[PDB]
Every structure is written in structure tokens, then in C-alpha cells.
Design an enzyme around this catalytic site. Sequence first.
Site, PDB file in Angstrom:
ATOM      1  N   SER A 146       0.878  -1.206   0.000  1.00  0.00           N
ATOM      2  CA  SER A 146       0.000   0.000   0.000  1.00  0.00           C
ATOM      3  C   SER A 146       0.899   1.235   0.000  1.00  0.00           C
ATOM      4  CB  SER A 146      -0.995  -0.081   1.132  1.00  0.00           C
ATOM      5  OG  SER A 146      -1.640  -1.325   1.111  1.00  0.00           O
ATOM      6  N   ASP A 250      -7.697  -2.431  -7.556  1.00  0.00           N
ATOM      7  CA  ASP A 250      -7.309  -2.249  -6.172  1.00  0.00           C
ATOM      8  C   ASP A 250      -8.341  -1.402  -5.421  1.00  0.00           C
ATOM      9  OD1 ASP A 250      -4.795  -2.290  -4.246  1.00  0.00           O
ATOM     10  OD2 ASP A 250      -5.649  -0.258  -4.261  1.00  0.00           O
ATOM     11  N   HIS A 299      -7.097  -5.672  -1.738  1.00  0.00           N
ATOM     12  CA  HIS A 299      -6.122  -4.684  -1.279  1.00  0.00           C
ATOM     13  C   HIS A 299      -5.019  -5.362  -0.475  1.00  0.00           C
ATOM     14  CE1 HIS A 299      -4.779  -1.176   1.350  1.00  0.00           C
ATOM     15  NE2 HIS A 299      -4.430  -0.883   0.109  1.00  0.00           N
TER      16      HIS A 299
HETATM   17  C1  LIG Z   1       0.719   7.988  -3.981  1.00  0.00           C
HETATM   18  C2  LIG Z   1      -0.644   7.379  -3.684  1.00  0.00           C
HETATM   19  S1  LIG Z   1      -2.039   7.463  -4.660  1.00  0.00           S
HETATM   20  C3  LIG Z   1      -3.017   6.562  -3.627  1.00  0.00           C
HETATM   21  C4  LIG Z   1      -2.304   6.156  -2.508  1.00  0.00           C
HETATM   22  C5  LIG Z   1      -0.960   6.670  -2.515  1.00  0.00           C
HETATM   23 CL1  LIG Z   1       0.265   6.354  -1.252  1.00  0.00          CL
HETATM   24  C6  LIG Z   1      -3.112   5.401  -1.437  1.00  0.00           C
HETATM   25  S2  LIG Z   1      -2.172   4.566  -0.145  1.00  0.00           S
HETATM   26  C7  LIG Z   1      -3.446   3.406   0.456  1.00  0.00           C
HETATM   27  C8  LIG Z   1      -3.008   2.626   1.687  1.00  0.00           C
HETATM   28  O1  LIG Z   1      -1.895   2.795   2.266  1.00  0.00           O
HETATM   29  O2  LIG Z   1      -3.774   1.737   2.126  1.00  0.00           O
HETATM   30  N1  LIG Z   1      -4.153   4.530  -1.978  1.00  0.00           N
HETATM   31  C9  LIG Z   1      -5.016   5.282  -2.876  1.00  0.00           C
HETATM   32  N2  LIG Z   1      -4.350   6.153  -3.790  1.00  0.00           N
END
Ligand SMILES: Cc1sc2c(c1Cl)[C@H](SCC(=O)O)NCN2
Length: 354
Positions: A146, A250, A299
Amino acid sequence: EDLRLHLLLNTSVTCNDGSPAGYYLKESRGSRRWLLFLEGGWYCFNRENCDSRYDTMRRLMSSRDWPRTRTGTGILSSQPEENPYWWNANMVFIPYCSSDVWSGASSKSEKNEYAFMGALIIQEVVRELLGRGLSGAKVLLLAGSSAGGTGVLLNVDRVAEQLEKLGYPAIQVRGLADSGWFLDNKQYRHTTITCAPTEAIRRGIRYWNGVVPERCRRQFQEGEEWNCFFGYKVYPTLRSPVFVVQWLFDEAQLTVDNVHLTGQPVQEGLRLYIQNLGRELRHTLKDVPASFAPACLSHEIIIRSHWTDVQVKGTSLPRALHCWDRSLHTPLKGCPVHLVDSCPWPHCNPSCPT
Ligand SMILES: Cc1sc2c(c1Cl)[C@H](SCC(=O)O)NCN2
Ligand SMILES: *[C@@H]1O[C@H](CO)[C@@H](O)[C@H](O)[C@H]1NC(C)=O
């Protein structure tokens, strides 16, 4: 309870609230493989939303309440039954307590309510581990899920440069980015909560003093470093081998795209939106030779206990990673490393998680 907490001896390298950052370690004395895993968990990008995160997600901002041990699961498991890939490796879990996608290099101060030190936490963990066996490593795999998967993309080449400058040019640094490969696409409906990741990351970089890999920074230049948080833009600039794991649908991508599936029939506009998202993801992975991208709505993958279950074209992720290791000793008979589903709808792969 097999990984033991070590708070950083350099207590200037801190979580958001100034408490020391740290890592959890389980050594494997007979192994020269080291796995350093970056936890995920979104981010915060101004005082108000960081204050809210401090109230109800404090373990992601502070070490004050961390437990003395954690159990290694999935790719962090030391049991071959659960981790066919690297069960005998030295295992390190680095808690995410900087809320900056692992990009920050700013201390708490009279001008800064919070410290954002993610990039320095990784550096300091590596430095302190060299004295605990990492100096003898042959492979350091920087993995993460993530926001931690995006953190791998932002930091793998800096770890490589750090080890080279410290005099350890024989350690091969590689990256494994899980669920951190996002698209800066149009939302399905255009509605903190309203702030799209490009804009939130643009503000976050300034709030965090965020840093990005040098070659990507040189391409996009001042004010445009947010682009380097998007895998398909930063990946081509990286020199270290990076294996990309990404669900085609995702859940965090869909959340930022304002897509919420309930159970009612999906109508044509949303159907086309979802199908185009999977197609775009698949397109961005076409020239990523080491990748695992199943057509599932889910996820994260790698630290889940049942991570072994999903397959693309009959190959599991632990097998693909093993094939990647062999490839870094052209393609290998029956040992593929590029595994991207081509079917167009979530769960068209029967092995997707329930
Ligand atoms: C640079 C980006 S764009 C984006 C993310 C990031 Cl980091 C997050 S992180 C999600 C998590 O940690 O569960 N998800 C959605 N879209
Ligand atoms: C502690 O970390 C800071 C921030 O990275 C660094 O500037 C300093 O040199 C470190 N000190 C020691 C003794 O490692």
C-alpha cells in the site's frame, strides 16, 4: 511473536510525534537474505487531518504504544508452509509512523507540529542493521504494501546508493512493491475527502519536505515531484530491480476514484469505468518484466497468511518471486516472472481472495 522491537538508537529519527521510530527483527543466522518490509496506511497532509489521524490512528504516528513483538505473516513468515519464497530470510518489519508515504525528511520543531521522517527512517534502519548482520548480506529486498509499496518505489535506489557509499557494494538491493502502483486518473464522480491523490500528494510534499528519487526529480523538476509517487512514472527511472504486485482493481484506487460497489447491478457507465481502469493498469505493466497483477477487487497481498493462494496463469506469487530470484542469478522454462491477467472484470480470475 517472532519479530522483536528495536527502537532506533538515533533518537533524532522519529515518528510523527517525536517518539523514536524503530523496526521489528527476526534474525536468521544461516541466511544472507534480508527482507525489509514497509508498512502502509494512507498518509496525512495538513495539520487538521494529521491531528485527526493522531486521535484514532495513533500507532501510525507514534511508537509510544507499540508492542514488544509482532508475528511475521505471509512473506514475513518463517514457516515454509506459509512462506515458500523466503521463509529462511532475516525478517524486518518497519512500522509506518511518519504518514508521508515514506518520503519525508523533516523534524518536529518550533515551526513543525509533526515530524515527517519516512525517508530517513528507512536510511537509519539500514544503517543500524549493518551492525546486526546486514553487512554480510547478499540480497536486501525492500518490500512494502500500500503506501509502503509506493515507499519501496521512492526509496529502493536510495538504499542502494546508501550501501554503495557506506562501502557495501556487494549487497544486491531489490524492491518488491505491493499495492502501491496507482493511477492519477479521472474519478468516477468528482466529489480532505474531496482532495484527489495528486493534489493531496502535492500538498503533502511541501508539508513533509518530501523527497523523491533523483532521476525522477530531474525529469519532473520543481513543483512537479508529486508525479514520482505514481509507479508508472517513477518505475522507468529506477535502477534497482523491482517486482510489482498490483491488483488490477485495487480497493484503495477505487476509493480515491469514488467508486463504491454495493450489490445492485452495475450500470453501463460504471461498468465501462471499471473495465477501463483494469485496461489502463494492465497497459502500465506491459513493460514491467517482473510483475504479478491479478484481476481482483482487493487490497494488499504479501503479508497476508493466505498470500500463497492466488495464481495468475497457474503461477502463485511465491513461485513468481522465486522465478524472479532465479532470473537475477533469457526467460526460464516454466518459471515466469511477468504475470498480468487479461480478463476484464473483478474475480474473472477464480483464485481471487474471498
Ligand atoms: C501515492 C498514492 S495514490 C493513492 C495512494 C498513494 Cl500512497 C493510497 S495509499 C493506500 C493505503 O496505504 O492503504 N491509496 C489510494 N491512492
Ligand atoms: C541521526 O540521524 C540524523 C538524521 O538523519 C543524522 O543527521 C545524524 O547524523 C544521525 N546521528 C547519528 C549519531 O547517527
